[PDB]
Amino acid sequence: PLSETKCTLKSFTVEKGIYQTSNFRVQPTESIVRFPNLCPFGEVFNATRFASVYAWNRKRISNCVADYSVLYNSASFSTFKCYGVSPTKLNDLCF
Amino acid sequence: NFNFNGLTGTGVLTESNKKFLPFQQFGRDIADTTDAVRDPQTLEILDITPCSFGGVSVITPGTNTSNQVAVLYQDVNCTEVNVFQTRAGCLIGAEHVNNSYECDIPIGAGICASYQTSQSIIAYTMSLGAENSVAYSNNSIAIPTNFTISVTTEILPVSMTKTS
Amino acid sequence: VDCTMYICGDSTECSNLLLQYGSFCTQLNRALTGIAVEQDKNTQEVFAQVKQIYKTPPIKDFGGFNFSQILPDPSKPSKRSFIEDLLFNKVTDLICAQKFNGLTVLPPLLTDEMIAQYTSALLAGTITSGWTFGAGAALQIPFAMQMAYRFNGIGVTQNVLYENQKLIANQFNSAIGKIQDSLSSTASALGKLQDVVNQNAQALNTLVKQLSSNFGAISSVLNDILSRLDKVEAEVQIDRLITGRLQSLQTYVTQQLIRAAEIRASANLAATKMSECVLGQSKRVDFCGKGYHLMSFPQSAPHGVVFLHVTYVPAQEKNFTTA
Amino acid sequence: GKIQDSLSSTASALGKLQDVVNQNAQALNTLVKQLSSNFGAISSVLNDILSRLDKVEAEVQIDRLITGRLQSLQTYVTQQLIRAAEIRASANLAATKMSECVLGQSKRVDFCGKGYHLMSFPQSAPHGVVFLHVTYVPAQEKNFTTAPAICHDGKAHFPREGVFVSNGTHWFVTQRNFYEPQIITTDNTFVSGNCDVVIGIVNNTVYDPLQPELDS
Ligand SMILES: *[C@@H]1O[C@H](CO)[C@@H](O[C@@H]2O[C@H](CO)[C@@H](O)[C@H](O)[C@H]2NC(C)=O)[C@H](O)[C@H]1NC(C)=O
Ligand SMILES: *[C@@H]1O[C@H](CO)[C@@H](O[C@@H]2O[C@H](CO)[C@@H](O)[C@H](O)[C@H]2NC(C)=O)[C@H](O)[C@H]1NC(C)=O
Numbered sequence A: 001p002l003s004e005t006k007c008t009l010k011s012f013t014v015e016k017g018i019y020q021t022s023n024f025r026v027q028p029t030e031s032i033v034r035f036p037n038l039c040p041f042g043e044v045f046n047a048t049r050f051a052s053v054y055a056w057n058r059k060r061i062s063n064c065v066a067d068y069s070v071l072y073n074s075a076s077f078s079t080f081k082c083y084g085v086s087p088t089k090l091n092d093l094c095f
Numbered sequence B: 001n002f003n004f005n006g007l008t009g010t011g012v013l014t015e016s017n018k019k020f021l022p023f024q025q026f027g028r029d030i031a032d033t034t035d036a037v038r039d040p041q042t043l044e045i046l047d048i049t050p051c052s053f054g055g056v057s058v059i060t061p062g063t064n065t066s067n068q069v070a071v072l073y074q075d076v077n078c079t080e081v082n083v084f085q086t087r088a089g090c091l092i093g094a095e096h097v098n099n100s101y102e103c104d105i106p107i108g109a110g111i112c113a114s115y116q117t118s119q120s121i122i123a124y125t126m127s128l129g130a131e132n133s134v135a136y137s138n139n140s141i142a143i144p145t146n147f148t149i150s151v152t153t154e155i156l157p158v159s160m161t162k163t164s
Numbered sequence C: 001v002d003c004t005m006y007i008c009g010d011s012t013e014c015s016n017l018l019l020q021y022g023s024f025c026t027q028l029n030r031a032l033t034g035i036a037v038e039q040d041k042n043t044q045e046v047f048a049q050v051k052q053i054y055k056t057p058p059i060k061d062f063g064g065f066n067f068s069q070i071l072p073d074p075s076k077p078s079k080r081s082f083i084e085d086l087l088f089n090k091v092t093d094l095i096c097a098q099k100f101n102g103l104t105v106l107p108p109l110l111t112d113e114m115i116a117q118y119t120s121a122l123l124a125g126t127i128t129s130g131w132t133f134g135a136g137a138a139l140q141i142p143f144a145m146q147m148a149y150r151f152n153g154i155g156v157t158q159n160v161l162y163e164n165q166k167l168i169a170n171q172f173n174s175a176i177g178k179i180q181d182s183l184s185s186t187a188s189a190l191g192k193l194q195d196v197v198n199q200n201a202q203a204l205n206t207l208v209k210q211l212s213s214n215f216g217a218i219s220s221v222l223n224d225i226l227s228r229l230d231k232v233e234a235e236v237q238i239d240r241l242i243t244g245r246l247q248s249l250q251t252y253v254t255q256q257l258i259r260a261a262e263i264r265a266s267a268n269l270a271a272t273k274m275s276e277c278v279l280g281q282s283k284r285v286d287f288c289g290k291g292y293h294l295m296s297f298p299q300s301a302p303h304g305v306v307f308l309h310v311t312y313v314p315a316q317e318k319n320f321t322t323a
Numbered sequence D: 001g002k003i004q005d006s007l008s009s010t011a012s013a014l015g016k017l018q019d020v021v022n023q024n025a026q027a028l029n030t031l032v033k034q035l036s037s038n039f040g041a042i043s044s045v046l047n048d049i050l051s052r053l054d055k056v057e058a059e060v061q062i063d064r065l066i067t068g069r070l071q072s073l074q075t076y077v078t079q080q081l082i083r084a085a086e087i088r089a090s091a092n093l094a095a096t097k098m099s100e101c102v103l104g105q106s107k108r109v110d111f112c113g114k115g116y117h118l119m120s121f122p123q124s125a126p127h128g129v130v131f132l133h134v135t136y137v138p139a140q141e142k143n144f145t146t147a148p149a150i151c152h153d154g155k156a157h158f159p160r161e162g163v164f165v166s167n168g169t170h171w172f173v174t175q176r177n178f179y180e181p182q183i184i185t186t187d188n189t190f191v192s193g194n195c196d197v198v199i200g201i202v203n204n205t206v207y208d209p210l211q212p213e214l215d216s
């Protein structure tokens, strides 16, 4: 913690008096996830009958868990894009 | 580093006496920053708080005198770090002194450090001034019999380097 | 303020970008430290002009003037004159909220208890030693024989006081009393102090609330703004946060610099009064407050100072033909 | 002679000046270093962005250079303005001291430095001024019994200037800031009131210049 002062002072002779050098941020020991199914992607993505665009089908989905892995492991999909979504953090995301 | 029902945050979770309304979720503060939370699996009111933070401060006599330094951790409690606890934070490497001398290297809240006694950086409550008590009585006057003429340099800026 | 943290919370991703703005982060600390340093220089210049700490004698006989109001209270744990407590109650969470994001409140070098020892000394020497303690070693002089001079200062021959002493005693004391209620019954007298404290806590709130603004970025949470966004596109987003926030500091910093420069001017005004008015007797008309000035009594107040100016105001007139 | 010894080894007494010169070159330095910063653009060299890319892209990048540098000026400039006023107030104080202290004699207390002020001698210094304040400081004190007044015949006698003192027997009136005792005569003292009112008046005899002059 002394040598940092010489870098902040920018002088091999640090004259008398107190110098602010660095900051310490206590890092956290471990994570607490304190929550108080499966999501039908085999029923949506392997579904047998999609309607057209004039009467498109909409399925509100909640209260289940995301299988976001095999989405990327599918790799038979032509155009697959995401805006504001990260693949690594997709599992981490809690919609 | 906590996540409560999708709420994420990093703090010091403690017991707390503040009492929610039942339907509520987050307590908050004037800054809208998350303050208190309710543990979902068993309802209890947990505070939150910053980590130790503060700035590091290296108290040193001139490198001409010593290479020894006393580190002041500002505004922390001495755990997360010869140690001494101050008003201004956690000080390390300066031996406390019950004696009180002139403030020399100002630290905070009256704590002032100086190098002298072998030697070690010390830390002590600064004495403001030396003490005197005027000897006073309603008939008592003290008239100077002799004087000095002192020349005291006083120095002021006038102009600064002009630029364009 | 911690520039790297306040801008980039807990993210190296953002933290690396900040390096591309160079010395902004450092020069802000260099700026605020310049303020923070001279603040304890202000308080240094004002309060401690006196070489030694004088203390009042054990027994108070001033000729009828009652200073128990203004002198340190021996029965308080922190010894502060009865009046000063009225002040510390008027002036006044923000305790850790600011301290979340790297907004720190450093302790003033001089504790309030120390400030009350200076303003005891200055007030102890003023009473016993007259004005001479500012010019050198304090000289005990009978207080009633002090006020004979301070009349000669304003042109009233001293034979007025030696004859009117008892009267002047009561007028003084009864004047001190009303100073209590003047403070006690109205909270707007301290507005000057109260405004300073508010404006500081004001901008801090504003500075904090700037963390929650989008600044054109998709969100104000740096995690969602940087981690959710592609390590390619999220760069441009975090700029709008950084550029926004980093600017928002310079706004705050510049305000403090300007505002401190006002206080720096007000501090000298105090240090001028403290030297001329308290330590000496002022010949400057209405510099010490309306009327011919006799003496002044400093009193500390939070991040401020309060003077009690004892002044001489004539009253009853009689038309006279003159030549 | 003490002054010249102080300066001979004192780097600090000029700290006020040395700081001002520093802080400018400081912000001047920092102003320069800001020419080396990316500011988000792909490089901090102006041309090296150009010759790398076709200009319709450079028009975008050079923003983040200009937006950066232009800001860094307004930071530096707004600094100087603030810092200028700081010198500005100091310059006003110097004019006040130059005017009052040197060209006058300042009745103001501790404006010209501790002690009663006699005169000041200005001395130039780089980007500044240095006053040598010659001040009159009393030294040796002697505890004296005093009285605010002296009865004579029942009239009260007060000093014109100074105070009645005694070393314990003979009452002397003396000037205040120096001990110069003198026997008490009407030329020292004026008559006001009588012996009842004054608090602390003592019993004494104020010698008369005139009475002996008669006796022949
Ligand atoms: C100075 O004034 C204070 C109050 O302003 C006096 O203290 C009071 O003393 C009387 C005794 O007759 C008590 O009944 C009161 O309760 C006291 N009040 C307080 C607030 O302490 C004090 O006696 C006065 N002293 C002089 C020398 O004038
Ligand atoms: C106080 O000062 C007076 C003034 O000098 C002293 O009176 C003189 O004392 C000396 C003693 O050496 C005698 O020789 C003179 O004749 C005295 N003159 C007068 C006019 O009295 C006095 O003695 C001093 N007293 C004390 C206690 O210091």
Ligand SMILES: *[C@@H]1O[C@H](CO)[C@@H](O[C@@H]2O[C@H](CO)[C@@H](O)[C@H](O)[C@H]2NC(C)=O)[C@H](O)[C@H]1NC(C)=O
Pocket: D201, D202, D203
């Ligand atoms: C000064 O002298 C006067 C007399 O000229 C003193 O006044 C009287 O003092 C005696 C005691 O010695 C009392 O018994 C009398 O009652 C006093 N006068 C009256 C009318 O009451 C005085 O005490 C002496 N001392 C001073 C005042 O300094």
Ligand SMILES: *[C@@H]1O[C@H](CO)[C@@H](O)[C@H](O)[C@H]1NC(C)=O
Pocket: B064, B065
């Ligand atoms: C400072 O150190 C130098 C050697 O680097 C020495 O010559 C000089 O005497 C020292 N001065 C003080 C005040 O310590």
Ligand SMILES: *[C@@H]1O[C@H](CO)[C@@H](O)[C@H](O)[C@H]1NC(C)=O
Pocket: B076, B077, B078
């Ligand atoms: C430090 O922690 C101890 C207990 O852990 C507590 O008694 C003390 O008050 C704390 N001090 C500060 C300044 O937090």
Ligand SMILES: *[C@@H]1O[C@H](CO)[C@@H](O)[C@H](O)[C@H]1NC(C)=O
Pocket: B095, B096, B097, B098
């Ligand atoms: C000061 O004295 C107390 C006892 O009153 C003692 O506990 C403490 O250790 C002393 N401080 C130092 C630095 O020795």
Ligand SMILES: *[C@@H]1O[C@H](CO)[C@@H](O)[C@H](O)[C@H]1NC(C)=O
Pocket: C317, C318, C319
């Ligand atoms: C002096 O005379 C004027 C005449 O108008 C009057 O106003 C004033 O009150 C008089 N002074 C006193 C003390 O009565």
Ligand SMILES: *[C@@H]1O[C@H](CO)[C@@H](O)[C@H](O)[C@H]1NC(C)=O
Pocket: B135, D141, D142, D143
């Ligand atoms: C005056 O009396 C006080 C009484 O304590 C003493 O301390 C002081 O030294 C005396 N003055 C001189 C010049 O000795």
Ligand SMILES: *[C@@H]1O[C@H](CO)[C@@H](O)[C@H](O)[C@H]1NC(C)=O
Pocket: B137, B138, B139, C061, D199, D200, D201
């Ligand atoms: C001065 O104070 C003393 C108390 O020590 C007292 O006896 C004396 O009467 C007082 N004299 C005056 C004039 O106040």
